[PDB]
Amino acid sequence: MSGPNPNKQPVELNRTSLFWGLLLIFVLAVLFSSYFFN
């Protein structure tokens, strides 16, 4: 019972998604840093 859960699925993130996420987070930081600081 405590063992193989049949709903276990792998999680993927290709390099395109990694670069999009990095760009999104860094651009959001660039945008909101001026407003958090002031």
Partner 1 sequence: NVSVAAYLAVLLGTFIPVVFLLTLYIQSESRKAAET
Partner 2 sequence: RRRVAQAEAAGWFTGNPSFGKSLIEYSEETKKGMREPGTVSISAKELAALRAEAAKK
Partner 3 sequence: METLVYVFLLAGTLGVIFFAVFFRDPPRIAKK
Ligand X SMILES: CCCCCCCCCCCCCCCCCC(=O)OC[C@H](CO[C@@H]1O[C@H](CO)[C@H](O)[C@H](O)[C@H]1O)OC(=O)CCCCCCCCCCCCCCCCC
Ligand Y SMILES: CCCCCCCCCCCCCCCC(=O)OC[C@H](COP(=O)(O)OC[C@@H](O)CO)OC(=O)CCCCCCCCCCCCCCC
Applying CB under 6 A, the residues found at the interface with ligand Y are 12-14, 17, 20-21, 23-24, 27
Nearest-10 Cα torsion for 18, 24, 29, 30: 120
Residue 35 interacts with partner 3 (CB under 8 A)? no
How far is 29 from 35, CA to CA, in rounded Å?
10
Q: Per-residue contact track with partner 2, 10 to 29, x per CB under 8 A?
A: xxx-----------------
CA dihedral 13, 14, 19, 25 (to 10 degrees): -10
Q: Could you say which residues in the range 1-38 bind partner 1, by CB under 8 A?
A: 10-15, 17-18, 21-22, 25-26, 28-29, 32-33, 36-38
